[PDB]
Symmetry: D2
Subunit: 243 residues, 4 copies
């Protein structure tokens, strides 16, 4: 199943879409500068692009938030004409965030919170569902089920690694196919950035994209360019072969 | 460090406290009947007892009943306290809930999945209430100190640390019995309690006895084990706890 | 199921047996020194005791087996050692009451068969990568090769990289699926990924009701065992 | 570091080499027939190929056939080499097997369960042959350097590291795609190959094999027109990856 995000087509048999941006919105000018760089690189390589940012470091020490965050996203969308993606944490956030942000993201540790699931679904926006670090990939079916029961089928599934002992993550490359097979071939994307815990990012990205995926998260010599050239070469090859 | 909870002393070298009750508040009379059975059995055996329930929580389907909700839940907690004279514990998900819940409930509980969330931590801290911190299944025991430090910074030192197992492959939990000691040593010997119900019956008994062997402040369980085998179960736990606690560290 | 080892009754509802000794036999005099201490401590505590040692990581099988014979003569206790080769099993088992399948060799069917054939009691070291519900597959093999006198020895489970964790639920899974054969707990291996830690882990494991405790390890052993004995005595006095 | 295995160049920046064949040797006829299929497919695609089989090993039942044994097994290997002109690989379990096996078999393989058995390591090293070290599922990739050091101390540096997956809770194996790089960085860029079969459906094996090979590896190891379609896909990805300069 493909999802149309403005003029972008996202699907497991389409050319991969890059999701990327900043960890957390600090200011308008630093956001616009970061987004400009991604746009420039993706444009010249011909890779579709969706800008990503959080308005919150929710876990940091006692060390811009919603209304100002949305203002910045509005400007990003005006200047560059691309879609954006952000995370939501509470039901009450969903409708106002969804008014501006094309894709809204369910954090992996909140995936069981059915009140947030309902509030997200109700917006009718495209939703990115991050897989919990503890969950079998065949269990993503059950979260997909909830969204469908809540009346939203515009769903993206997002790998971010699995718990591996204490304080470590491994990515099970078999999980991609399991999610595609059990969840009706919804777009599957790979959060490489959060899976890592640094040519390691490139190895990981390439291994994941070798399984035939809709897209990838990457965080930004011209390292981003160098990575994307290689990922695009691999993606183009894989997508040119019959499934 | 011990924590006083009304007349109860909670401490890693005190007689274990039972935190027990039900999953979600659904009905007043049913709550009172279940609580009555806990109270009756714990009184019979001389075990300190704190009644547990959730007023609002996610279930396995989007429309399964989440509980009576905050306003009716606190009314039910009030009736439990008035009838039985015992402390109660409940969880919260959002900062706005922290004050109204803390006014009524003796212990407030930070769900394991929210335990790294700063805004909720600060809001819970500022109630001044005793707080039960559930250890996320994806967190190492030496990292509990980071959560404790946030609470300390925000002015609240009355903290309990609650084990509920660690992710082990897919869809599975193991409880590291060494984690208890790591939490004691790294978090200033705050009370450590063991949620055997969510760490998973012959099983619950084995796992409870193993955990309590390491010398813990308390045991945390839900029933709907089977309610009637509670006395059998608690007899064995109290036996072990009394033996362990009666020997010097 | 209980197993008789000479005068000892080994079983999940009998008083726990200690397996303990030295890593590798280096000399006769040394062996007798370490063993005498274990015997002296355990005798006064009333804890049945089986002396454990390897004959090669040191002195080799020829010298090793003479040493073991001397231990048995002097002290009158059973002994336990690992075997690595099918040919070794018969000669070793003439002397050593219990013979041990190393964890790394657990899938080596020709050793299993050669061990079974001796009719000796066998200690099966559970690999850290084997689940407790798969131990029944090793037990199957020994049963088909005609030997049912098996002890299952827990050593911890792989937990991410390097680290080990002991699943306290695995003890019960092994009892239920392997016909309640004696289960013992190698607390030491489980740790080498310390005094206070070994005590907590040993107490926790023995709280699940086990046949024995297995150590790869001013009066630390005696004081450790007092505590373990107290727990065990309590647990074993409770109806199952 | 590359390794020359007759006319084959094995290394992390060379075209991938296929290792595969049969589980245990039974007869000359049976062996030649399976090996012929591998040879035909790999020759048709221009993929270097090393035939694999065991002469003697444990099975999943105590009375399953362990294989034809050392003497007849080596006779069969000799004939595979003469008939097809390819290198072969087999595992050894005992120091005393190492010399005669190494007389015939181009690569000798250290089973994962024996990875830390010093006396076998030494005996394997002393043959001077190319050695394949199977990485235990309970050993981390940074632990492989210790095995490598043993071999080096015993005088043999012609070593391949073979990934097989890692223990992941109960029963499951996961392959850490990051472990390949760790092994290359810590072990002097010795050839690393991927045993995709133990690591575990054709669909599944394909995904996993492609993922591993995307990290840039010396070879692919199978414990076993289907093989053709599979290899066509692996070669496509390998050729692409290998054709680009290392970043
Ligand atoms: Cl709870
Ligand atoms: Cl959790
Ligand atoms: Cl041992
Ligand atoms: Cl292995
Ligand atoms: Na030669
Ligand atoms: Na040679």
């Amino acid at each position: 199943m493909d999802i149309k995000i403005n003029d972008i087509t996202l699907g497991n048999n389409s050319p991969f879409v890059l999701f990327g941006g900043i960890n957390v919105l600090e200011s308008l000018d630093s956001t616009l500068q970061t987004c400009a760089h991604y746009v420039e690189v993706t444009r010249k390589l011909g890779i579709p692009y969706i800008f990503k940012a959080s308005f919150d470091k929710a876990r940091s020490s006692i060390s811009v938030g919603l209304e100002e965050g949305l203002k910045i996203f509005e400007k990003v969308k005006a200047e560059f004409g691309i879609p954006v993606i952000t995370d939501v944490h509470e039901p009450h956030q969903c409708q106002p965030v969804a008014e501006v942000c094309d894709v809204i993201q369910l954090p992996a540790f909140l995936a069981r919170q059915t009140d947030l699931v309902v509030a997200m679904a109700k917006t009718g926006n495209v939703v990115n569902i991050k897989k919990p670090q503890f969950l079998s990939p065949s269990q993503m079916k059950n979260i997909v089920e909830k969204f469908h029961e809540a009346g939203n089928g515009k769903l993206i599934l997002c790998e971010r690694g699995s718990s591996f002992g204490y304080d470590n993550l491994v990515v099970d490359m078999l999980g991609f196919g399991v999610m595609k097979q059990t969840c009706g071939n919804l777009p599957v994307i790979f959060d490489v950035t959060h899976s890592l815990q640094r040519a390691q990012a490139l190895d990981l990205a390439l291994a994941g994209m070798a399984t035939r995926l809709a897209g990838l998260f990457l965080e930004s010599l011209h390292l981003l360019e160098d990575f994307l050239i290689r990922i695009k070469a691999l993606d183009d090859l894989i997508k040119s072969q019959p499934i």
